Structures are given as structure tokens and as C-alpha cells.
Amino acid sequence: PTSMKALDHTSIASVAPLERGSVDTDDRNSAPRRGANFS
Amino acid sequence: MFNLKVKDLNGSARGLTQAFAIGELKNQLSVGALQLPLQFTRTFSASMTSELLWEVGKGNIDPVMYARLFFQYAQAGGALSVDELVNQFTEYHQSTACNPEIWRKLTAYITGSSNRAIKADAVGKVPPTAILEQLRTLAPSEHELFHHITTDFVCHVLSPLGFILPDAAYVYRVGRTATYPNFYALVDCVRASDLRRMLTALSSVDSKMLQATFKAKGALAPALISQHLANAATTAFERSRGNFDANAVVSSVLTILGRLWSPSTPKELDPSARLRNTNGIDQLRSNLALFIAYQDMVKQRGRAEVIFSDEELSSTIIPWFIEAMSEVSPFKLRPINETTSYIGQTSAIDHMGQPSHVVVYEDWQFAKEITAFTPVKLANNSNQRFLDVEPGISDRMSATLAPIGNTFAVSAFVKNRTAVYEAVSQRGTVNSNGAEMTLGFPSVVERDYALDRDPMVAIAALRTGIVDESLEARASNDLKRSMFNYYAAVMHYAVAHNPEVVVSEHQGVAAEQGSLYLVWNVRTELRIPVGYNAIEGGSIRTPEPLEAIAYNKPIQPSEVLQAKVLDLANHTTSIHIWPWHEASTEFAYEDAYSVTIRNKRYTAEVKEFELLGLGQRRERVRILKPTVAHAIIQMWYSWFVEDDRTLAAARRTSRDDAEKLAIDGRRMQNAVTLLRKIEMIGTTGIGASAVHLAQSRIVDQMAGRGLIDDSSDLHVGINRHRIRIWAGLAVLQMMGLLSRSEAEALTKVLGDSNALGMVVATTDID
Amino acid sequence: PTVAHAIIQMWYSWFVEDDRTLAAARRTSRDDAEKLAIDGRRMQNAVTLLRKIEMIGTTGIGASAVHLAQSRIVDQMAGRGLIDDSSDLHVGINRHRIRIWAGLAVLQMMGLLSRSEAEALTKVLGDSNALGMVVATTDID
Amino acid sequence: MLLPVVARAAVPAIESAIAATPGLVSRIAAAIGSKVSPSAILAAVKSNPVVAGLTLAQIGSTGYDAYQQLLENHPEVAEMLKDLSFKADEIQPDFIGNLGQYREELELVEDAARFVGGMSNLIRLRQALELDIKYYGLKMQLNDMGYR
Amino acid sequence: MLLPVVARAAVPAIESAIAATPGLVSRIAAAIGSKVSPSAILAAVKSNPVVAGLTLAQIGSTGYDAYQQLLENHPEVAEMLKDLSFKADEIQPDFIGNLGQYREELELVEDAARFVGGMSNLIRLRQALELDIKYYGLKMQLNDMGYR
Amino acid sequence: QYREELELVEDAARFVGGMSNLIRLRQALELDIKYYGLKMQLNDMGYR
Amino acid sequence: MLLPVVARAAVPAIESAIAATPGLVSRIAAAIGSKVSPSAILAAVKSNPVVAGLTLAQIGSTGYDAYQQLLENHPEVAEMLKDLSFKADEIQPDFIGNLGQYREELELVEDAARFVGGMSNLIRLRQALELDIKYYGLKMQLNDMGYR
Amino acid sequence: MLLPVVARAAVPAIESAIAATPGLVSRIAAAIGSKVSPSAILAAVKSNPVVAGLTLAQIGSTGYDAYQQLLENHPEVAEMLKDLSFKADEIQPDFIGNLGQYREELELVEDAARFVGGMSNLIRLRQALELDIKYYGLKMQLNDMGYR
């Protein structure tokens, strides 16, 4: 099997956002919002 | 929707009152006591634009916009001011340019060759983000936004030679601009004149010569590059050096205006006969946007001082101050009539003349486009993530939303309102109070959704005038900056339609040495005052910009205000670094259409992914918020329930036969126009596919029990008119446009008026 | 096609012989102005390399390895019950990773190189970090 | 400095607390970091609002009134006041694990919530069912009389 | 019915618990609502998986093993079974108010979190600072030797 | 004697942000560990 | 939810440790921050995998087996769990300076390494020389017979 | 990190052996260079596979199957472990030493042979390192005089 290991450990060029925020939102699932009753 | 009692302005809305702007928290504000005549013929309005995504990585430098990035990074970023920023930029620029090594070391890296010439063929390629990585170590800074500006500088001189990879890309969002200058927005835009003269020197370096000597000779040492950069970067360092403090350019030149407006200026300090005659003061004398800026100035500093030489020096300041602003900037001078064009007014008149209610509203062009992106991480625990626009989800909604657009235009809301106050009002005068003034500002509520803030603190900011501290500074900085726009946007309006204005000087409580407030001359031709003033002479002189509105006749907005959507589609590859989770709404929905057929209950559930044509439920995708669309609908909801409330409030106490029948004449006529509108939404692409499915979950649920079929002569129609209505909410519910609570009350209103009962009554013949 | 295996065997010999000397020539210098000439040379190769391999990947033999590499993972994944792939396998890294591995396969599926030689040729792109600093792909259709 | 409106009411509140007991005078001198003399701190209060707040935190008995009114007088001191005055709330050893058991339970409510409507509705609906039966009879009867 | 793979382990597990003590036999007969005779419930277990689960909830000592294996081969019952078997977790009187005090505090963490990165990072960064000083020296020295 | 010291704070200040932030961040670290656990758990329940 | 495959092994493993000694029950209650009652923590383990891991760190004797199996079926917690459970390794006062002396030495090996090849080769080549002489004779003789 | 699959194979293997006899502490410290304590050597195993493979081969009663399991599960350690464990086979008086035992060794020579050159060259190179240090200095000095 070919080894892609070495190529796997890498870093990404870093950069800083102008306005910080939205950080912990990376992984979340909001479960759906219901509609109103009808009549 | 914001209601104020114009009689007591102080209590109801202190944000828009002038008494607050010049520093009177207490009730008292001077009457038309002392005065000087004046005419404001010009103003500084921001150009009409809203935020756009602009990408910083590529080799170009567009000086106007990098300047704009500083505004946002420093100001809205939470930092002190762009002034302190730019200063720390030129200490940074002095560090690299005036330093001989730092231009060698990174031309050793990009060219690869320390001690010897490089041929013409053997020219490698170094990606832009690379050289940035190292420049970080050489000339370190606490602001990454500096390293980007130097990085794509060297990229610009080296681009022709081809030492760098083009392919890499990167992106930020520039911010929104206040339409009218706050005091500091002057100070900023003066420093940003320096900065723009900085960058225009960096930007303009061609290095064509270095390109010619490379071709013919065939090779060149780093000694030619590393000088030719160092010559460029020190041409920019020239142009920075020796500019005046913005803080003391403006602080003075708003004072020496402030002394030639105010009538009461002590002769001990009088702007002299020369500077009064200076070229350009004439023009800046009659300019409004400065005035309301001046009022701010004294609100804060409390005072003023002229440091600059009162004569010889201060006559080279002005021509420098004019050239800063006058030059293309975010702020460009315009005739005063134009900048308020979109505001419009309408009023409900008694028999005599005077206002009962009077409405002020911002017209809008409803935004008919919407986009949906899926966020994609670069690597685990990396915030670089860049989104992919997905067409075919968006083509649905924008072809769904386009039908909604035509039918909600704002003018049709107030055209509806005044039709209410015609019917509800008695026959008799209104002496009891000043006419209440309701003002729709969809822009207010709009800014609350993109910033995610309780509508109650936004309104209550205008009412009491103080901003709640409980919120984090990122909001307050966009809240106050907002609350100042409306203040300004009011006075440009009042002044535009009452060209006669008169400048007094407030000194009752002696809060500040120098103060100013306008007083309008408006000729009312009315018997009794609204608000409170003596209404003497057949004209009333009112310090409050609001009152001076109330006496206007109806006005039709001549220019639609324009929202415009943020654009993801264009640059797909570039990695988004700005947080996009603020402007993103999660997209998921569930609902059940319940009907009762022959004494049982049949419920059809439905999911949003089915409505869109998607076969599977995909979690990731996030609708980019439809703010201005949610702004308008929010308005139209609150004015609907408000109307329908005020009628059923009168309908009880009417005590007349002729009039009572005119109320129920109104409600019914109202509610079935309500419904014919929602039924119109049901025929839309999402409306269609919601219906087709709902009937189909109901059918196969009845499979087990054989029961007789309908006439459908009108039954197909009666059933049809009902199922559409429920589509109408479902589409509104699933997009952000209507919250679930207000969707219920909106059913209840349509429910008891038995609107549906009356809708069918037109489809039968008897 | 031994004439072809001859050249590409040579190229891999010389190329590795470079980076052995530079990192050898760097640690000798013990002077800063030079070290950035070398550290600029290492990187400046490792992209020119990383582009050769990827440009190789675009070749039809190249492409057909790509398409098939993803396609089997997508369909392997859909059974596992989550489709988040489509977004993720096209990214800053994993579009390069699979791009390269298809570029080193085509060399190995031919005689042109030995699977141990490619394994080391990878390790050069590992340290030089040329990978992370590009973040941009070119498609030869 | 210090705005006068705050001063007419604020100055005597502190002075009263000082005259009540000396033991506080040493405390505030430590917290604010001011000269122990009662005349000194009173000179500091007038000078800075931030300082004025920390004093009113040290004495909450009589002082709570002015403190709130000071919030209105200066937005900035209160904003930078909330941070300077802070105490870590002692956490119970059992708490975080004790919360772990309600994971199963709260997810049950939110299933019931979404169905009904806002949480406010469900609290109502719960009462409607818990409500005595006669009432259902009562309401039926008013409808029998043609009232609704 | 019940899948054999489960049933193989399930049946003797229950039968063992029965043989251990009679007191359980009466309990399960009450919960499942089946004839008290040990032969009856054992006939019911085989018939329905839902029933099989409730039995294994009644006896957790020896039975927990099979239950999980039942849960594997039957994701279907998993939802239904979770509902039928439920107990309200007794809540402490102090709890909800006791939580009210941490409102101020958690909002402080999430200000620090967003800045650093994911919560995982901040937990790391906190340790890095708390970490002994010598280590900073150690790492500096390896860089002195030219290691990276 | 504090010349050496204050220049140290202002190096830490600029990094974090306004002085107000650093006073907060300092507390966040000094804060008890359990709280980090608490916040993690609310996120475990799906509360943001 | 904890996956059953793990939970099957996990639950009795913990329960066994509890039954072994009470002294651990108080410890885990402190670390996880859960109600001290053995029934409580056992309710928490089932609820969260992260919690399940910290428990198995507290007891390593019998518990190490399940922990690894937990780690397999949950690569997710692996990162988070590694952070929450950490102890600063006590460093020896002599160490960092003691390492400073080997700077001269290791640079000598890496000069020899590059020449030969990978470090693996040099370890071999070193043995080849250290090897007894007769072997060189042996190999020569097989070549004398024709063997290669 | 050490693969969890092989982890459950090695850890009971090395532990049972350590508790079986204390004498095995002589192996761990000799090659691996682990700390004197039985607890720390365990952490070394978990840390590195190479370290682990040298723990498995050294304790041979229960270990072989476990060692071969480690091999396949983490194949990079193959070349390393087989090499770092080598034991000289001394000498056979009889002519037919063969590949019976000496197989591994005569392989080893050839690698070393291949690298250096013709079989003679190595034996030469063997001696050059065996020569007294002085002879080097001699050759250098006779070079200094300008003789070569």
C-alpha cells in the first residue's frame, strides 16, 4: 500500500479574522422549528 | 413600529429630540428667545452602498478600500479609533522601509539567491501566503492587517517578473457606512486622507525598468531588487511624514465655524475678518452635516480650544481640510434635498386641519434574491472554512420569493393605515393631546436581525436615550452609531422641507461655553398647536425637529431606498475568514396540516427538504439571512395587528349605528384582502409543492375506510381555498420571514373574522 | 520503456541529492542572510515539484484515478449513512492529497518508478510544508 | 471627575456608613487602595465614578440606593465596574454530575414544547388538563345559553 | 417475535434471575402485566421484543448484558422501549436557583472561548500557562540546539 | 521601580485587547476548573 | 448516548470496581463532579461517553480493557478526553542542562547517519563491524564454493 | 500512538509477566532505557510501538503471538524491531553452520557488504576502525609534511 503519511502532517497558513466570533459553532445541529397550528 | 406622543416629546422619544443632542437631559429647552437667520444648502451624505465581500490576497492594491478596512478593523473591531491605528501603522511603516536589512532578507527568500545574479529561465514560483509567513518573523506586529498590506505590495512589483504563484486567494468583508458623519467620522476620514496618499505611492510602483533590465541583460542580482523595493517603500514614507493631527484639524475647524454661526459669540474671541473671508468658509458655513456634527462635538468635549494660530496658520488649515473631505471619500457633498429623498410622510386629518395621527415611513424596494451556502472546514480545528454556494436550492427560493416581493411594497401599508384612521375616528376636534406620531423605520428592526438583538432594547434606546450596558460592546457600537443615523436622518428631513432655519444659543443651565440648536420657522395655518408652543403669528417656532415635521402636508417619497444582498457567488475559491455564522440562519422546518373529514382528524406532516425537491435531509446548508425581507414583513405584521386591534377597541365603544357598520365594514374588508394575499403566495413554487404533497398524505391515510366522494362544484374550490392558505403560512414559516408566535395570532385574526367564510361567498350564485 | 525509466530514475536521484545538500549547506552557514536564501530554495523546489505531480494527475490516467478514488469513497460512505463528503473531499488539503496520490500512482502503475522511491518522495513534501502553503488547484479537464 | 447630580445624593450615603462604623473605612481603603483617612476616600469618590462604585459595593446596607442611581449617571464606570468587582461563586461538588441526570428529562420537555408551541403555551395547557372537570361543564353550559 | 441471536442469550439470562429469587417474578408480572407464573412471562418474552426489554429493565444485575445485545439487533424497539420505561429524576429544591448564580460566570468563559478557539483549545491553553516555568526553558534550549 | 513592570502589562494588554478584556481573561484562567466542565456539559446537551 | 458494544463491557467493569472498594466511589464523584451515590455515577456513565472515560481513568486496574474498547468505537471523544485528563509530568532539575551536553554528540551521529543512509542502516552497519571476524571468513568461503 | 487494537494485546501480556516475576525489570532498563519503576515502563509501551516491540520480544513465555500481532497492526515497526533486536550466534565447530541459525547473520553481512563495496573492502573498512587511534594521527602528520 502507498504511504500518504508524511504528506498528512501539515499546518495551514494562519490568519486572524477582523471581527472575532462564531467560533464554537463549528459543529452543532439545531433540530427543526415547528409551524403553527392551523384552523 | 414606534409610537410617540408629540405633545410630550421629552418623555416619549428622547433619542430624536434635539434637547438630548446638545446635552439637556432635563426637560427644559429654550424657546424662540434669541435667534440668527440662516440657510443650509449642502450636506455630507455617505454614498449609497452596503457591505460587500472584498478579497485581500491578490497582488492589487486599491487604496480607497484598504482604507475602508482600517475603518472596520479599528472602529467596529472594538479598538479605540482608526486614528490611533493609522499612527501605529506609520511607526510600523517607518520600521521596515527605513530599515535596509528587512528588504534584503525577504528578497533572499523570494529570489532564492543570496549572493549571485539569477538567470531568466530558472525562475521558480513562491506562493504569496509564503512570504507573509516569514515577514511575520522579520517585522512582527499585533495587527495582521498590516502584514497583508506589505505582502501584496511586494507581490505587486514582483508580479511582472513572475516570482510568485497567482493562484492563491483570500477574502474579508468591508463594513457598512453610516450615512452621516459622526464627529469622529470626520476625524477618521481626515486621517484616511493621509493613508490614501500613503498607499497611492505604494500602489503606483510599476518596476517596468527592473523588467527591462532583466530581459536584455538576462540576469540581475538581489542587489537590484532589494534596492528597488527600498526605493519604493521610502517614497511612501515621505508622503506620510508631516501631516497635521486630524484631531486638531477638525476640532479647530469645527470651532471656528461654530463661532461664526452662533449670534452670541463674545467679541473677545471673534473669528477675524480675514478667516471669515477665507476661500471656502463660505461654502462650509452653509453646510448642514457639519452642524449636527458640531452639536455632537460640544456634547462630548463640552468645550473647544483653538491651538492653531488664529490667523496665519488657520488659513492654511481650511484649504487642507476641504481637500480631505471634498475628494472622493465615503462622504460626498450633495444638495440637501436629495439625501432625504426616501423618507415620506402621511397624516390623518381632523375636519379643521390638525393631525390626529401622522405617519413617517421609509420606503423600500423589497429584496427578491436569496442565497444558500454550505460551510466547509479546511482542517480539524481550523477556522479558515470556506463555503460553497449551492444553486438549485437558491433558484427555488428566489423564484418563490419573487412573487412575494410585488405584493408587500411599503407604500401600500400606510396607504392602508390612513384608511383606518378615517373610519375609527369620531366627529369632533382633537384638543386632548398632540397628535401621536407613528413612525415605521424598517431599517431599525432590520439591523436587529443581522446583529441578533432583542427589538425591545433597540426601541427603548430611542425612548429613554441611554443604551443598555448588559449587552456586549460589539452591539452598542453599532447601536449608538445607528441611533445617531436616525437622529441625523430626521433633521435632514425637517430642514429639507422647511428651508427657514434659525440658530440660537443655549445657555439656560450653562452646561457648555459654546452650544447650538436650530429652531424652525414653519408656517402652520392652524388654530391650535400640536406639541406645545404658542402658535402665535400664523407661524410656530419649534426647536424640535419632530414637531416641525408634524406641520408638513403629505409627502410622497421620490426615491426608493435600496437594500442589496451580500454576494457569495462570485468568488467561490477564496477562503472566508470573516465570521459567516452571524449572517446565517439554520434551515429546517416541520408542519402538520390537519383537516377533519366526516368526523375524524387527518394530519399531513411535511418536511422542508421535501418541499425543495431534495430527496434526503441535508443538515449542513444554511440560508444566508433575508434580513430586509424579514424587516418589512415584520413591519407589516405589527401594523396589521395594531390596526385590527384599534378597531375592535372602538367597535365596542362606538355607540352609533352609522359608524358601527363602518367598522365591521372595515374589518371584513381588511381580513379578506389579507387572505386573498396569502392565497396568492400559495400558488408559488414552494406553495405548489406544499399543496400537492399535503393532499397526498391525506388521501393515503384514508385508504382503509371507504367513504363517499365530494361534489367539488365548489367543494374542490372550498377545500382548495383552504389548503392554499396553509401553504401561505408554511412558506412564510420555513423561511425566516414569520415567527411562529405571530403566525398563530395571524391565524386567529383570520380565524374569528371568519374570513374564509366570506371568501367563498363570492364564488356562489344565488 | 527503459529509456523512460532511465530518465525518471535519474531525475529522482538528482532531486533527492539536492535537498540533502541544501539542508546540509544550511546548517553549516551559521549566518542569517544566507539561511533565507536556502530556505527559499527548498520551498521554491517543493512547489515546482508539487505542481509537476499534480499536473500529472490531470492526465487522463491521472483523472481516472481521481474520479474513481472519490467515487468509491462517496458510495462507501452513503451506506455508512452520512453524505457530508461532497463538501469535505473538495477542500484545501484533501483535494491535494488525493491529487498527488493519483500522480504517484500513474508513475508506479507504469514502470517509471519504484513504490519505495515514491514513498520517500512524499516525505519531502511533508517537511517542506509546500502543501499547506498553496491551497489552490488547477484542473486540466 | 464626578457629575454633581450624583454628588448631592451619593456623598452623604458613604459618609453615613463611615460614621456608623470605622471598620468599613479600613476595608474600603484596602479595596480601592486609598489612604486610610476618611477624608481621603471621600476625596477620591468625587474624582472618579469607577472608584465611587467600588465603595458602594463594599457597603451594601445603606448604599445600594445611590449605587443604582449611579448606574444611570455614568454608563462607563458601571461597564468597567462589573469586571473589577467580581467573586467566584462557590460551586457544589455534586452539581455538575447532578445535572447529568436531567439530560434525558429536559429533552423530553422540548419534544412536548415544540409540538404545543412556545414554552408559555405548554405551561398553560398543562394547567388546563390539571384543571377541575366542572369547569369543562361550566364552559359547555355558557355555550348552551348561546354565549361564547 | 424475537431474533434468535438475542433470544439465545436472553432466555437463560431471565430464567437465571427467576431461579435466583421469586420476588422478581411477581414484580415483572406486575410491570409487563402478565400472568404471575414463571412459565407465562417466559412465553411472552419470546413473543414480543418490547416485552423482552421491560423484563431486562426489571432485572439489571445479570441481565444488562443481553439487554444491550437486544438493543443492537433491534434499533426499532429502541425508541418505543425508551418511552415505556421511564422514571422522573428527583430534582433538588436548591438546584434551579443554585444554577442562577452561574449565569454571570459561564458568560465569562464563552467570552474567553471564542477568542482562543474551540473549548478544547482553551482547556489546553489554560494548562500551558499553569505549566511550570522550566519547560519554557527546556523548549527554548532545544531550539538553541537547532531542533524543530 | 515599576517602569519594568508596567511595560510588561501593556505588552499583554495589546495582545488581548482593551485593558478591560485582560482583566476578564485573567479571571477566566484563575477561575475554578469545574466551570470548564460545566460549560462543556451544557454543550453536550445541545445548548448554545 | 454511549454505544452498547462499549457499554456492555463498560458498566459491569465500573460496577465491579465500586463493589471492590468504596474509596473510589468518592473519588470519581469528585472528579466527574457527580452525586456521591454509586447509582448516580452509573446513571451518568450511560449518558455521556466523555464522562465514561474519566471514570475509567480513575480506575485503571480492572478498567483499562473497556477504556480502550471505548476509545475504538469513539474516535470523537479521543481528542476531548485526552485534554480533560492530564497531569504535568514532574521534571527533574538536572534534566534540561544535562541534555545540553549531548548537543556536541548527537550532531556527530547525524553526520554519520546522512553518509550511510537512514538511521536503521547505521545501526546495522555498526553491528557488521562489531561482528566477529570469522563470519567474514565464512561468507568468503561460501563464495569460494560458488554460493552468492 | 499505540494502536488500541494491539494495546489490549500487549498490556496484559507485559503486566502479567511483570507481576509473574520482578526479574523482568532487567530487560526493560537495559535496552529501552525506561525508568526504574514498573509504572513508567508501562507508559513507554503505550507511547511508542518500537518501545513496545522490544518489551514483547524480551518477555517470551506468553509474548510471541502478541508480538506478531503488533507487527501486522503497525507494519512500520517491522524493519525497526527485527533489526534493533539481534543476537550473535557465536560459532559452530562443525563445517555446516548453515542458515539454520546463522541465516539472519549472513544476510546482515551482505547488506553491509553491498553498501561499502566488494566483500574485501568491508573487511578492510572493518580494520581501519579497529586500528589504534594513533595511526590516524600518523597518516595526518605524514600528510602535513607534504607526503601523500
Numbering used by the authors:
A (entry chain C): 293 to 331
B (entry chain B): 1 to 766
C (entry chain A): 626 to 766
D (entry chain E), E (entry chain L), G (entry chain M), H (entry chain K): 1 to 148
F (entry chain D): 101 to 148
Copy the relevant paper text.
We use bacteriophage φ6, a member of the Cystoviridae family, as a model system to study the assembly of a complicated multi-shelled virus. The inner T=1 shell, composed of protein P1, forms a dodecahedral polymerase complex (PC) harbouring the three viral dsRNA segments (S, M, and L), the viral polymerase P2, the hexameric packaging protein P4, and the assembly cofactor P7. The expanded PC is covered by a layer of P8, forming the outer T=13 shell. Here we present the structure of φ6 NC to near-atomic resolution using electron cryomicroscopy and single particle analysis.
